[PDB]
Amino acid sequence: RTVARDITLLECVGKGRYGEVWRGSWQGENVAVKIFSSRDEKSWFRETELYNTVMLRHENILGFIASDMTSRHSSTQLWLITHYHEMGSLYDYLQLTTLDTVSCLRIVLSIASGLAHLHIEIFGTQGKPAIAHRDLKSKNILVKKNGQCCIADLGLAVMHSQSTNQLDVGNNPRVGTKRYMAPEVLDETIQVDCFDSYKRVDIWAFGLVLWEVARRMVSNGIVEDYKPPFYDVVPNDPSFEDMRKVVCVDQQRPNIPNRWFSDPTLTSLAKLMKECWYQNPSARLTALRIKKTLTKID
Amino acid sequence: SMQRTVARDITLLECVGKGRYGEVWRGSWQGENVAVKIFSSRDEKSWFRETELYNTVMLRHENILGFIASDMTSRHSSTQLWLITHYHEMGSLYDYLQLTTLDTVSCLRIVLSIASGLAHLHIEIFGTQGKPAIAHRDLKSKNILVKKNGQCCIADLGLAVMHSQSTNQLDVGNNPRVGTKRYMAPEVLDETIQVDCFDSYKRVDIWAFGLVLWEVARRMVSNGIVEDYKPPFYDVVPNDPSFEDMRKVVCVDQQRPNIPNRWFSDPTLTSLAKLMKECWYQNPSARLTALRIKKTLTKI
Numbered sequence: 001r002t003v004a005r006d007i008t009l010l011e012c013v014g015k016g017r018y019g020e021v022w023r024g025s026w027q028g029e030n031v032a033v034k035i036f037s038s039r040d041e042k043s044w045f046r047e048t049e050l051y052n053t054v055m056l057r058h059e060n061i062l063g064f065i066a067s068d069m070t071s072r073h074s075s076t077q078l079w080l081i082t083h084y085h086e087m088g089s090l091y092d093y094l095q096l097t098t099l100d101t102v103s104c105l106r107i108v109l110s111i112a113s114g115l116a117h118l119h120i121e122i123f124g125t126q127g128k129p130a131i132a133h134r135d136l137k138s139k140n141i142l143v144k145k146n147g148q149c150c151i152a153d154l155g156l157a158v159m160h161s162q163s164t165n166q167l168d169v170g171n172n173p174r175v176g177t178k179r180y181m182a183p184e185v186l187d188e189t190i191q192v193d194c195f196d197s198y199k200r201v202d203i204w205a206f207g208l209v210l211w212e213v214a215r216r217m218v219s220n221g222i223v224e225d226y227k228p229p230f231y232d233v234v235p236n237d238p239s240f241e242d243m244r245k246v247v248c249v250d251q252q253r254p255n256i257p258n259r260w261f262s263d264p265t266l267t268s269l270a271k272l273m274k275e276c277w278y279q280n281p282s283a284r285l286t287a288l289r290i291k292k293t294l295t296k297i298d
Numbered sequence: 299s300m301q302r303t304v305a306r307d308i309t310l311l312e313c314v315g316k317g318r319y320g321e322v323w324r325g326s327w328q329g330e331n332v333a334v335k336i337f338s339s340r341d342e343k344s345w346f347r348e349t350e351l352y353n354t355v356m357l358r359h360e361n362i363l364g365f366i367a368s369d370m371t372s373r374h375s376s377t378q379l380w381l382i383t384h385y386h387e388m389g390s391l392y393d394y395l396q397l398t399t400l401d402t403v404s405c406l407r408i409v410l411s412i413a414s415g416l417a418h419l420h421i422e423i424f425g426t427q428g429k430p431a432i433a434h435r436d437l438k439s440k441n442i443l444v445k446k447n448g449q450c451c452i453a454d455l456g457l458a459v460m461h462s463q464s465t466n467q468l469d470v471g472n473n474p475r476v477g478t479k480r481y482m483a484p485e486v487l488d489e490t491i492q493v494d495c496f497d498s499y500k501r502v503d504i505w506a507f508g509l510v511l512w513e514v515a516r517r518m519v520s521n522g523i524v525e526d527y528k529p530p531f532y533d534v535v536p537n538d539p540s541f542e543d544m545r546k547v548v549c550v551d552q553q554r555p556n557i558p559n560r561w562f563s564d565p566t567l568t569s570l571a572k573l574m575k576e577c578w579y580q581n582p583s584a585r586l587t588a589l590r591i592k593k594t595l596t597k598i
């Protein structure tokens with residue numbers, strides 16, 4: 001029996017504009033400590049609430065352990081303590097690793113299973129509201145030693161319940177990662193009062209991640225280098241406007257390499273991406289349909 | 299004496315109060331008294347709301363309870379949440395008025411200090427070093443502390459809402475709670491309140507303030523005459539009145555707190571009576587603002 005604040009921070013393993021993640025030691029075991037900037041305090045709270053009230057728990061959702069906050073003198077320390085994944089993010093994993101058909105499908109099915117689990121309302125004692133993520137990307141997915149993935153970073157999440165028909169968007173000024181923003185977010189037509197709109201934004205982002213992964217699967221003895229979505233048409237840290245011109249005005253999407261089309265698996269994955277990338281959000285596949293499709297190609 | 303792992307440097311000494319969130323304790327921290335407000339896990343939204351208001355608005359004022367710290371720790375099926383503030387040994391206005399009568403100077407000092415706290419919450423300050431308007435939403439004599447200098451400060455921002463013009467997303471939070479029934483304005487009771495107008499919430503605070511002003515005025519001695527402490531509407535609702543009990547008296551019956559005709563033979567009580575009256579208009583838009591009350595009281 002010990003307290004969360006007594007976790008020993010050992011090394012910083014990730015660092016962005018909104019926070020840091022550290023490998024920490026708690027009673028001799030590795031944990032991950034995400035430390036939020038005070039500026040992203042509403043994300044820390046949303047995640048904490050989700051994990052500690054909805055009790056979100058699933059093989060493909062990052063395992064919560066604890067949350068801790070202390071504030072004084074305008075200094076606020078915001079910690080979310082989770083299961084530690086030493087292989088790091090999917091983004092990290094894809095840089096050099098190449099995949100065979102089995103490992104590629106294991107990765108994308110586990111992500112689909114995580115997302116389907118989030119999107120669906122479950123009834124009964126072990127139930128949950130429907131949840132949309134709103135910042136899905138390869139840096140927000142962890143790779144486990146067993147080859148499965150799990151989805152992290154629920155701080156922008158929005159929720160919906162069938163019995164009340166109530167949408168819970170919380171209040172957070174943080175917006176999703178610009179590279180992964182759906183057309184409707186970029187041209188500001190997204191119907192913000194509709195829960196389904198948020199699920200559809202997640203589906204868009206999932207198709208981009210699918211593309212990042214599929215590039216690294218070997219066929220005919222070759223792969224493509226890791227690249228981020230839209231690598232050839234926008235800069236690093238692209239602006240809202242850079243993305244809008246590419247995605248909305250030019251109607252661009254990632255290109256599919258020729259070699260994919262002689263591989264049955266990559267051909268099926270290209271079709272799935274297309275079904276995630278429709279300009280019309282209501283035309284996109286659901287997470288459930290994506291999971292069903294992937295279950296059938298392995 | 300007890301410590302909790304949610305803040306190991308604070309020693310809890312005694313429970314001094316209970317509220318809609320739980321207990322408040324006198325505690326000791328680095329040799330000084332502090333007040334520790336302990337939330338149940340049920341109310342982590344109010345805990346966060348109050349913390350954010352103190353921590354990001356950097357809300358500070360002589361007549362707003364002073365924030366010291368906030369802590370929370372959470373695991374599966376165990377969550378502790380604390381707000382630590384300055385401790386006022388004279389206790390709440392509600393308790394003080396049970397035991398204490400007021401002279402004219404003390405009465406004015408109390409009601410002016412409440413008005414000044416409330417105007418500081420309510421006032422939106424525009425520009426780069428501004429401040430959102432804040433509405434309290436549970437103003438009552440139990441949520442005001444008496445300080446040793448004879449001024450008061452307003453406490454409990456767990457239900458408070460804020461609005462800055464610059465940001466376009468009006469949000470009454472998502473915590474399932476409204477005000478103390480006894481202090482609820484008529485428009486809350488008959489559901490006519492204009493929920494999309496941030497100022498509606500300010501006007502609801504002004505109605506509550508007039509009730510507190512009545513509670514206080516009752517205990518000012520005038521020509522050797524004073525009334526016992528009573529809560530607002532004590533003579534027409536029971537203890538712990540329901541939303542419905544209140545709806546009947548304030549809306550259907552149109553009841554207001556009685557203003558003894560005798561008050562009008564005293565200049566201070568006369569001014570206060572006029573102020574209460576102008577906090578109690580059925581029409582929320584006709585009510586005085588916190589700032590105007592403050593100026594009127596500063597003139598006395």
Ligand SMILES: c1ccc2c(-c3cnn4cc(-c5ccc(N6CCNCC6)cc5)cnc34)ccnc2c1
Nearest residue numbers: 013014021032034082084085086088089140152153
């Ligand atoms: C978003 C993403 C993650 C989290 C996490 C999180 C949980 N586990 N974990 C592990 C790493 C990590 C480990 C090892 C490496 N490397 C080893 C390979 N070579 C160099 C890089 C890199 C990264 C990062 N973050 C996390 C916890 C809480 N919120 C999050 C929100």
Ligand SMILES: c1ccc2c(-c3cnn4cc(-c5ccc(N6CCNCC6)cc5)cnc34)ccnc2c1
Nearest residue numbers: 314315322333335385386387389390393441453454
């Ligand atoms: C609402 C009200 C208060 C707070 C407080 C808070 C700060 N100071 N303080 C002091 C008391 C208190 C001291 C002495 C007495 N008595 C001794 C004299 N005889 C009558 C009983 C009674 C009460 C209670 N709460 C507080 C902190 C945080 N949120 C709040 C929200």
